[PDB]
Amino acid sequence: ICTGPNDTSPGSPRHTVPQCCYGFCIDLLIKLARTMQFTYEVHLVADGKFGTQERVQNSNKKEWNGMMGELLSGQADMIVAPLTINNERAQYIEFSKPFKY
Amino acid sequence: AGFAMIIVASYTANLAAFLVLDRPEERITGINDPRLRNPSDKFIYATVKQSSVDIYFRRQVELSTMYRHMEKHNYESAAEAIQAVRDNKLHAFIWDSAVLE
Amino acid sequence: QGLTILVKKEIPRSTLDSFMQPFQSTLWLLVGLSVHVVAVMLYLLDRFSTLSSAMWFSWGVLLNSGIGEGAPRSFSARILGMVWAGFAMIIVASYTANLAAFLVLDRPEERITGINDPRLRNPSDKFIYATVKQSSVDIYFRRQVELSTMYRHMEKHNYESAAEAIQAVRDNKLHAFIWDSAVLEFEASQKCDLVTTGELFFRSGFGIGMRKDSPWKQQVSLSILKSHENGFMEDLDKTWVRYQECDSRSNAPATLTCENMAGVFMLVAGGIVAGIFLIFIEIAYK
Amino acid sequence: EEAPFVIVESVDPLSGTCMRNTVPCQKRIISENKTDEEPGYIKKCCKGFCIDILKKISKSVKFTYDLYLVTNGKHGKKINGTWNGMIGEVVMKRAYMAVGSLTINEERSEVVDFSVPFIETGISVMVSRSNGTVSPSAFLEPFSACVWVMMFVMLLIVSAVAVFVFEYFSFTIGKAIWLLWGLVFNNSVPVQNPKGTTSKIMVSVWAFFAVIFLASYTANLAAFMIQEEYVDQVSGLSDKKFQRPNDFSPPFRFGTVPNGSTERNIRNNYAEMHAYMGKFNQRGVDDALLSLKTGKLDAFIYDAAVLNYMAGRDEGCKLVTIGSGKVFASTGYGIAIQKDSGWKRQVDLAILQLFGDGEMEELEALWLTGICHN
Amino acid sequence: LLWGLVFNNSVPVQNPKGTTSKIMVSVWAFFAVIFLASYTANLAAFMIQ
Amino acid sequence: KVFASTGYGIAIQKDSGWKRQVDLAILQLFGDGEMEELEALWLTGICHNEKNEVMSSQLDIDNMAGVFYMLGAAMALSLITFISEHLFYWQ
Amino acid sequence: VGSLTINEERSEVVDFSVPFIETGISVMVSRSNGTVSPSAFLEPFSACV
């Protein structure tokens, strides 16, 4: 199960419909869980963009939209997806060893 | 009769020549293909906004002419881009392997 | 003009006398048996439902000629011979094909290089590549420290003058010599074993040398520049630089003359000699 | 503004912004006559090849500079003992020294000075690319003569053997030669057959020779029909085609560009040809280019390096240079300097210093290269 | 007969007299030549890649 | 077809507050494409090509084996046909 | 530094950085010759011919 948005376009009913997600990473997640003794509840991101570090407010602050935003603000606590590695991202997050070069 | 043999041989030969030698194809490129260093009309080549690709470009100022020339077309998500290149709206999309392959 | 390299080219293995080339003589004998195999199967199928002839028949079918007048009398051998002929066509075609493949596709040659060929960035034993001492080449190298591993590795072989170097590379004493174009290219076009290689380095030019500022220096310059428009300069070339040519290209397909077909021409004569005494012994059977 | 050397373009309308690589490039003269036309400062910014080398020089000789485009004329063919063009703008000491693209030659080289040249260049020719230059002697190609004569003599001798063996085992020359020949050649022909086992064997093994022979031959021909050579047609201005223009064909069209250097050369060595050319001038470059795409124009004569550029960057990967770069009226580009500045020496030693460190590798490989380079 | 014709007619065979059949078999053989030549070309193709 | 797949690396004794710095540093390097030049300066060689073709020859091999098989197919089918004449030896 | 493959047994007695370059276990074998299909002859045609 996978709670997500019907964000087919800006202005949608935004109805956070439930759907079902599956595939590669989900498999990985399941293995991790069954070997790591916890529970979990996935759900897609708000916007759809991965995430970058942009100034906003027309003030001196720069935040992240995108997944990493919901990683830092607490909405979430682990990102499992095709997320690249980089420099900046490695500033504010920790990275497990890679898993597909 | 001599003449006859000459004909039929020659005919075979040229059929072979046609059948084996193909067109010289130039879609092939690299990254240093000048055709991606000095854009023109005929090369719009976008990417996915707010995506790690972007961060790699802008912080390598020596590529700037590329960078800015691309900013005016950058897309929104995979499906968008792929479905785009299906119909020659663009020419070239630039992304990461374990999706394209 | 500018700098390039040169190195002894290797002569291609375009084999003519190789006539039996595409067939691994084993297979040839295999044919030589299968033929009689089907022959005897034939006349067998004949006698039950023309026992020496069928031999003729088959060998004809393979060699497109020489015909007797045999045939199938049965119904079986009809199908037999039909597919037999099919087989025959398949052979001769395939043979042609592979002969073509051999004749057109050449060796993958790797003498070709550049300047960034690592094989000139990390020398070993097998690459001594000298130059002419106290020569402008030298000055270009040492003052480009990023090339130093090359530089020093070369210092232990540097030669004395052109003729020295060229006559050297004639006999594989070295592998690669590195010098400037308007000598090497004329060379490779006159002498006929040596060949240049990839692109250039040092877009320099030659030039008349003066003292410090003996006045009419300036004068002479003008004259030269003029000569480059009356073609007079341009004329001198044909008079000296690009007149002798060893026809030289990539590995070109080469017509064959007699180094191959002799390879079976002789067989011809052999078929002759045998015949005569066979004749005698033929009369014997008679 | 020549094409791949000195590219010009206008700032992003945001804030005079452009693309830190370039440098400010106003053409502060605006051509206008109806109003007083105070020279309008329309800021723009240029970049390219020549510009970079300018920048590196300036840094290594410690001075500063602005740029200043040009208005009247382009490369200044002198007229009425007067130099328009940038040669003008430097001879009348309104502008100190000129870069960009100025071929060297006599007429210029005495009113100003010159530096040491960058890169080879000169007059050359462009012409569209034909098709299928396969030799009209392709069929006779894959054999020498010795094959054929060896064949002939084999014929005669085996025929004689037919005579000598056929008479005694158990209607010969009137046919035998005919038969055997036919056999060699994919024996369409009909012919009576020699009875008797001796001859039977003989002719059979002969045919064996036949099959090999034919198959080989076809293979070799298939070989030659893969390595063509695309031998170009015109072969240098010395060709009479470029000398008997209207005579020995439906006449050509020797497009050129006026006002230039090259023209100044032609009209000093083949005035006759210059006359016939006169009626084909193609302003700018692209004009002639397209007109060459669509038959309006037959062949083109112009500076070299600009061509060895415009070639390797055309979609149809074929235009061509006539002799694989048979540059003949040969000289270099350079850098203009008004007479006798004690600088000249410094510029000189500087550019040479540059040639030292191979940077005129990178610049070259960064701008003056293109696909289809083969 | 006809089969043999297709296949580089080593074989011997009696010939149909009469202009109709004559024309027919001739034009058939025309098909034969093209066919064989093509086929060889294609094989030469595959023996290069 | 690398299959047991991982990377090289750099060893550090446990828990030096450095580790982080090394990390961010090497990543910074990957940024500016220098791990292009180093790579192209050492870990490359001639013969770098995808595919080619060499003039094979002299085929007494499984191909002609298949051909000879299609041959013997003839003898099979022939003997199959043969007895059919016995059938009409009774009709 | 130098060359140390990463793996479990190592990765708990020391630490590790972020890796440089892909790697792992692979195989080398001398190169054979002439892998021409044993079905070359049947190749250049479909059945419909």
Ligand SMILES: *[C@@H]1O[C@H](CO)[C@@H](O[C@@H]2O[C@H](CO)[C@@H](O)[C@H](O)[C@H]2NC(C)=O)[C@H](O)[C@H]1NC(C)=O
């Ligand atoms: C050089 O270029 C000029 C363009 O400036 C062309 O010349 C003539 O151009 C001037 C400039 O406007 C006109 O006033 C003349 O009417 C033009 N025709 C003449 C002078 O016959 C031309 O491309 C070149 N100059 C010449 C003399 O051919």
Ligand SMILES: *[C@@H]1O[C@H](CO)[C@@H](O)[C@H](O)[C@H]1NC(C)=O
């Ligand atoms: C040159 O210009 C002057 C005026 O400036 C004029 O009197 C003279 O006739 C002109 N002659 C030529 C050859 O251009």
Ligand SMILES: *[C@@H]1O[C@H](CO)[C@@H](O)[C@H](O)[C@H]1NC(C)=O
């Ligand atoms: C070459 O072919 C092109 C198109 O294939 C066509 O213009 C014409 O057949 C030939 N033209 C020239 C200039 O050879």
Ligand SMILES: *[C@@H]1O[C@H](CO)[C@@H](O)[C@H](O)[C@H]1NC(C)=O
């Ligand atoms: C391939 O050819 C080489 C020499 O040409 C020889 O070792 C043998 O014939 C073949 N070896 C292998 C391993 O295929």
